[PDB]
RNA sequence: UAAUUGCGAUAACGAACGAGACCUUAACCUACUAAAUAGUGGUGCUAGCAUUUGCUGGUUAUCCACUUCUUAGAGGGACUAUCGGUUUCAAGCCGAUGGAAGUUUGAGGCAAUAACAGGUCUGUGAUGCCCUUAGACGUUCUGGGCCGCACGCGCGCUACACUGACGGAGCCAGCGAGUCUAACCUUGGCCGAGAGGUCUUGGUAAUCUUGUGAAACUCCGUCGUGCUGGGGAUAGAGCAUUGUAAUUAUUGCUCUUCAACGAGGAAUUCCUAGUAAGCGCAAGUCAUCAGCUUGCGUUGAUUACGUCCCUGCCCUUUGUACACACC
């Protein structure tokens, strides 16, 4: 029945205590990692942080650092500013 | 043709006004600037450790010139948010009673506000003409 | 010099304590409900009822 | 689901049935005269009394 | 002499109509109104479960009282000012007179 | 808030207080890896070694090291408020203390066998494993057992 | 006296009353212009009634707009349905019924609840649920 | 384009884009067309309707959502995983800054590479788990073009939101990506793939 | 308990009430507590006019065996109600139309 | 792979084991007067273009 | 039809309760009556900028005018209104038009005959019977217990993150409650990181708390794809309040400690638009104690728009060895 025993009652005690890579992404510049980026960012047509960190291992610090230094040097262009995401192109001539 | 804070956006104006306190240097800064949070409802310092003080006197003199007159309790209330009682849910506590008075004294001593009837505080002749000059400063750096 | 609301509540319950009175010590009289006259200086309650003279 | 019930047909039958030559087609003029024709406890009912009114006055102008 | 009779009550139609014939009392002698102004009516609201033991399914009701109040502005002398606050009394009304 | 190239100054990994730390993330949550320390205690330590809150714990130097550790240590005499410090107020020294590293793990298990010597119930139900603080053990954790 | 009217938008709580008269062509919301509302995303939102009419009909007009009750959005939306209720009874009120017409027309060909208010209000809750509809979890066990 | 001043500037950039043509802040809903004419009526597109953000009444009808932008229903459909619900104000920042990775990565209008994809991903025939004695047997059975188009727009934002949980890549600019692949039909398009995995189950069980 | 609730129910018909009702609940004869209603004429129990026209009464008697609950529902006539309604929201009473005799000549009746 | 068109000219209400699914008539664009009844997994009105990615495909009835 | 709602049929006619009808509440009113306990506008005084002619404010004894917003009361308004298809061509259905509202306009209150051997004598001075009734099971006083933990189960709160966390800014609701001869709601001023402490103030309340300056949300920043700045569970130390009394920590606050959890198995819940869901607020208990509940408001979706496949409901027919009735 539905009353069960002391025994089936102190079953409780034996029921026991069962139950049911990292990245290394940039985070700090060096001259390879610079070099590469001022020769590289003048593709990707479409630039980001997380387009950064795909495409150059960068540690998204960094990424916001780098765009907005190469803002500055312009050979990005922003076409939109967010405190969370930024937008930048080539600043190309032909688009 | 006539500048007033309210013609100007509230974040650029308040940015605008801190740096300027910043530069001025001749705003009372409290000795635990660098040390305690603005409340018990967050749980980290401010991150612009050396300007958040100048961030918070400028956002107060925008509010005070904006409303009829306020206290500490309203300034409490407005700069509190929502905190966790652990993993119960979010209540809403208010700022710290001797940061948000502590600028309205210090507003005071520049002589921004001045302590006036009915209670709390209310933008002075010199303080108001100053926010209007800091919004002319802005509508000119803005071109 | 009370509130409003505990003004009207407190008449409230003066009205069910009255008429629950009024029915316990009334019942053999055929009371059937009370009302409540309240003037400025002066209340008056009146019993409806069967056995009037008997009330009196 | 907008069927009309028992009380306001059999009182719009009641009311046509004797102010046929004073009942109209306009539903705001069965409107206004019910309210001096026929006494109605409520304007819900009013408004359906007359509504219905006309109605019926729309079929028995086709026939 | 300027007197602010503040009527309160919870029958509509009694508190009304008490309201309306101290105004018409009031404007055929002329004294100064500002009308029978009508604050709104508060809710004196109570929720309680229906069942008295804890039983059956988890009901609840609200139990409700209104309560309407009004006001009326006048400027009467004293000998006007005794006729209208004796003329008229109803059962429910509470009315009290104060100055200015 | 600049570009520049680090030079080999900058070490990956280094030792503080017999635990490690780390050297890419910044200062503050690097020295929150010392236990004793958390986020507002790291952050207030930063602060009084005025070692730059943008600069990662990889690339500083020795001496801001030494300073910041040295602050920890004795944070009294730097200017800390006594309510700031984890020892407010200590058992048998009138002091204010600031246990860190294995000297909080000594310290904290001085308080519980003190605890249980004095046969408080708050000893007691450390000795025994159970909630101390007056929960409710009828329905939750029961797995830890 | 100025040739003026006063309109009210609503959405939800929110209420905003806004003065409209003859001048010089400014839009002041609690004395700030309207290149300031908040959100930003809203902000064309709020300039799609001139957006789509034209300024022109805007060049001489004073209009202040002040709002209270109900959330960020609800104000905005409060916003513009008074201007645009505005501009429609002035240009009914003071010009003629060709200007009102065209200008109704116009509203009403982008949107409808310009000139007409939300119809859509709370539903209040019901008890044995958080909200109006939801009830708590049903459990036989 | 004639510039009309007041008292209270208003934007000359405003003025140029929105004033003239009922367009949005940077793209036009002109020359903008739909590849199927299965959904002509059930994309909505050739309409002026600015902002992505309204108010207006779409489900008092079954069909009264026809009427929605699929813009607006895309934001729509942005905040529905738990905590995200409401915020449309996310949304529309969101589906805003898709929009402008639209432009950057290509030429043609991102209201028109929406629609495209929207066509192309959208499932024709769908498998019916129906009843049965004993076993289930799956039936194939035709979809309704405002199927296709709800389908279709919970693939893309299912897709964009389990790409972008637990990573850098923001929703934005995953969504945008999703986008240009099911514009194009690429098979790391999660929409196109579960689109195509459907059909093919339901060609299977015919 | 048969007599005393006719006798009542009789009373208030004869008083000139609309309806009545008494149902007495409890032991009764037998140890198994039943109810015993005694309706006659007409009541009411759904609508607003509950309020109005329906005085229901509820009252205890304790006797030897236990507790007998009495309640007593009388629905007075709505046309002898001083004040609210006069009778039902479905009652809808059309007065007679006057009797129109048609026209044959017209005429003009001077002053 | 190549598909159809046809318009639906007529619905003749639902079918399946939940009511789910919807029968109509449809017509092919091209191909005219040759109308089939089909299956439908969704809403549906009069006068609405479906693609079949088989013509000739019948279903009367769907447990 | 939502309906035993009706149209009709008709050995039934005439009725009654129920549904409906009714009532409340949320939506419309440039219409009435108005309003220093709600406002707006203009003219006074005054502040700042423009310096200007205009802009934004402060000031109610500056007065004046009005009731648009706000409050009401009295009413009107919706009655599927109009049109077109559709049906013994009826009841009614559908599409379009207008309209604030066109699913009973949305949500609720009340809610029939019969019944359960459902729950309650731990609400009752409402009681029958039995028991006890003075070292009583009455009452009271003190201290524990109702929380105790090997385990299982049911409501729930937080989470597992970049649709994010943290720090700064913008920062806007509603429901409602509140003391006087007793202590409530408490603004303002001062001190203290903080909890909080202190001196006063307005309010028996549309008048003051309170525009409850709430949160979620928006904008500017820092991070970074990992047991991380997610999570703060468990503990230590200290700081105040409530309360005669907190320890078996009430709660709050400061620092430190930072556990499981990587989207949750078989199963199972709720839900059709301002609804789900998120987010808080008011009140209830209350000296203090919310993660609970009753309501309120903010932000606010996709899918339904059908069906009897699962669980069932209503009507008719049918079979029955069922009547405490498929258990």
């Not at chain 1, 942080?49 to 540690?59: A, E, F, Q, T």
């Not at chain 6, 000893?123 to 007056?134: M, Q």
């Amino acid at each position: 029945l539905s009353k069960a025993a002391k025994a089936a009652a102190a079953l409780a005690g034996g029921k026991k205590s069962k139950k049911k890579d990292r990245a290394q992404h940039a985070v700090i510049l060096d001259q390879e990692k610079y070099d590469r980026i001022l020769k590289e960012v003048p593709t990707y047509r479409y630039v980001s942080v997380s387009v950064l960190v795909d495409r150059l291992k960068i540690g998204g610090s960094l990424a916001r650092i780098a765009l907005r230094h190469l803002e500055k040097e312009g050979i990005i262009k922003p076409i939109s500013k967010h405190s969370k995401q930024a937008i930048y192109t080539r600043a190309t001539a032909s688009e | 043709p006539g500048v007033s804070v309210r013609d100007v956006a509230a974040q650029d104006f308040i940015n605008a006004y801190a740096s300027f306190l910043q530069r001025q240097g001749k705003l009372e800064v409290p000795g635990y600037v660098d040390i305690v949070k603005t409340s018990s409802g967050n749980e980290m310092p401010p991150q612009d450790a050396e300007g958040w003080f100048y961030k918070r006197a400028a956002s107060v003199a925008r509010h005070i010139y904006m409303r009829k007159q306020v206290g500490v309790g309203k300034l409490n209330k407005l700069y509190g948010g929502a905190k966790s009682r652990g993993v119960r849910p979010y209540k809403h506590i208010d700022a710290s009673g001797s940061i948000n008075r502590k600028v309205l004294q210090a507003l005071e001593k520049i002589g921004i506000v001045e302590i006036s009837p009915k209670g709390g505080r209310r933008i002075s002749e010199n303080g108001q003409r100053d926010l209007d000059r800091i919004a002319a400063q802005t509508l000119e750096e803005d071109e | 010099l009370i509130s409003k609301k505990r003004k009207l509540v407190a008449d409230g319950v003066f009205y069910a304590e009255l008429n629950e009175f009024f029915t316990r010590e009334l019942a053999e009289e055929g009371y059937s409900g009370v009302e409540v006259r309240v003037t400025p200086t002066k209340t008056e309650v009146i019993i409806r009822a069967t056995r009037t003279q008997d009330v009196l | 689901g907008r069927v009309r019930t028992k009380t306001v047909k059999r009182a719009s039958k009641a009311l046509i049935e004797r102010y046929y030559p004073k009942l109209t087609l306009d539903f705001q003029t069965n409107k206004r005269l019910c309210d001096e024709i026929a006494t109605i406890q409520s304007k819900r009912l009013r408004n359906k009394i007359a509504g219905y009114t006309t109605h019926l006055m729309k079929r028995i102008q086709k026939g | 002499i300027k007197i602010r009779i503040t009527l309160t009550s919870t029958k509509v139609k009694q508190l009304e109509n008490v309201s309306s014939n101290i105004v018409k009392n009031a404007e055929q002698h002329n004294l100064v109104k500002k009308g029978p102004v009508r604050l709104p009516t508060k809710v004196l609201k109570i929720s309680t479960r229906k069942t008295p033991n804890g039983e059956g399914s988890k009901t609840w009701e609200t139990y409700e009282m209104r309560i309407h109040k009004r006001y009326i502005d006048l400027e009467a002398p004293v000998q006007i000012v005794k006729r209208i606050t004796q003329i008229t009394i109803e059962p429910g009304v509470d009315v009290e007179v104060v100055v200015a | 808030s600049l570009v520049v190239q680090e030079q080999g100054s900058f070490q990956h990994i280094l030792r503080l207080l017999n635990t490690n730390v780390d050297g890419n993330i910044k200062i503050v949550y690097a020295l929150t890896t010392i236990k004793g320390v958390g986020r507002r205690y790291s952050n207030l330590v930063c602060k009084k070694a005025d070692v730059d809150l943008h600069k990662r714990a990889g690339e500083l130097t020795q001496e801001e090291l030494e300073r910041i550790v040295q602050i920890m240590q004795n944070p009294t005499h730097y200017k800390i408020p006594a309510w700031f410090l984890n020892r407010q107020n200590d058992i048998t020294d009138g002091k204010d203390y600031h246990t860190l590293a294995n000297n909080v793990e000594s310290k904290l298990r001085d308080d519980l066998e003190r605890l249980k010597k004095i046969r408080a119930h708050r000893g007691i139900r450390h000795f025994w494993g159970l909630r101390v603080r007056g929960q409710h053990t009828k329905t939750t954790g029961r797995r830890r057992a | 006296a100025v040739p003026s009217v006063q309109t009210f938008g609503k959405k939800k709580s929110a209420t905003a009353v806004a003065h409209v008269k003859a001048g010089k062509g400014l839009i002041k919301v609690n004395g700030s212009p309207i290149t300031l509302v908040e959100p930003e995303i809203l902000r064309f939102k709020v300039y799609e009634p001139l957006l789509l009419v034209g300024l022109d009909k805007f060049s001489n007009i004073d209009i202040r707009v002040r709002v209270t009750g109900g959330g960020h959005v609800s104000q905005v939306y409060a916003i513009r349905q008074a201007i645009a209720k505005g501009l429609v009874a002035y240009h009914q009120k003071y010009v003629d019924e060709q200007s009102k017409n065209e200008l109704k027309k116009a509203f009403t060909s982008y949107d409808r609840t310009l000139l007409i208010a939300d119809s859509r209000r709370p539903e209040p809750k019901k008890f044995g649920g958080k909200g109006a509809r939801s009830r708590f979890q049903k459990s036989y066990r | 384009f004639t510039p009309v001043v007041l008292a209270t500037p208003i934007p000359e950039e405003v003025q140029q884009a929105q004033t003239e043509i009922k367009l949005f802040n940077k793209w036009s809903f002109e020359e903008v067309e739909v590849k199927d004419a299965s959904l002509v009526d059930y994309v909505q597109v050739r309409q002026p309707i600015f902002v992505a953000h309204t108010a207006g009444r779409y489900a008092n009808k079954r069909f009264r959502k026809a009427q929605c932008p699929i813009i607006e229903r895309l934001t729509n459909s942005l905040m529905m995983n738990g905590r995200n619900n409401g915020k449309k104000l996310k949304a529309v920042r969101i589906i805003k800054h898709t929009l402008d990775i639209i432009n950057v990565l290509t030429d043609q209008n991102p209201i028109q590479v929406v629609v495209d994809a929207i066509t192309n991903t959208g499932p024709r025939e769908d498998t019916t788990r129906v009843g049965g004695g004993g076993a289930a047997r799956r039936q194939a059975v035709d979809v309704s073009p405002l199927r296709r188009v709800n389908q279709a727009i919970a693939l893309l934002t299912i897709g964009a939101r389990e790409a972008a949980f637990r990573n850098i890549k923001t929703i934005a600019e995953t969504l945008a990506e999703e986008l240009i692949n099911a514009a194009k039909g690429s098979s790391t398009s999660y929409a196109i793939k579960k689109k195509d995995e459907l059909e093919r189950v339901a060609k299977s069980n015919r | 308990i048969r007599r005393a609730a006719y006798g009542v129910v009789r009373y208030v018909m004869e008083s000139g009430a609309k309806g009545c009702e008494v149902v007495v609940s409890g032991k009764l004869r037998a140890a198994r507590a039943k109810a015993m209603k005694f309706a006659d004429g007409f009541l009411i129990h759904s609508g607003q006019p509950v309020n109005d026209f329906i005085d229901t009464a509820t009252r205890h008697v304790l006797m030897r065996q236990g507790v007998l609950g009495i309640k007593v529902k009388i629905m007075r006539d709505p046309a002898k109600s001083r004040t609210g309604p006069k009778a039902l929201p479905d009652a809808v009473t059309i007065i007679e139309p006057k009797e129109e005799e048609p026209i044959l000549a017209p005429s003009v009746k001077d002053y | 792979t190549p598909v159809t068109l046809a318009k639906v000219i007529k619905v003749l209400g639902r079918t399946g084991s939940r009511g789910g699914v919807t029968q109509v008539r449809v017509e092919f664009l091209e191909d005219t007067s040759r109308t089939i009844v089909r299956n439908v997994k969704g809403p549906v009105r009069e006068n609405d273009i479906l693609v079949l990615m088989e013509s000739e495909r019948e279903a009367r009835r769907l447990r």
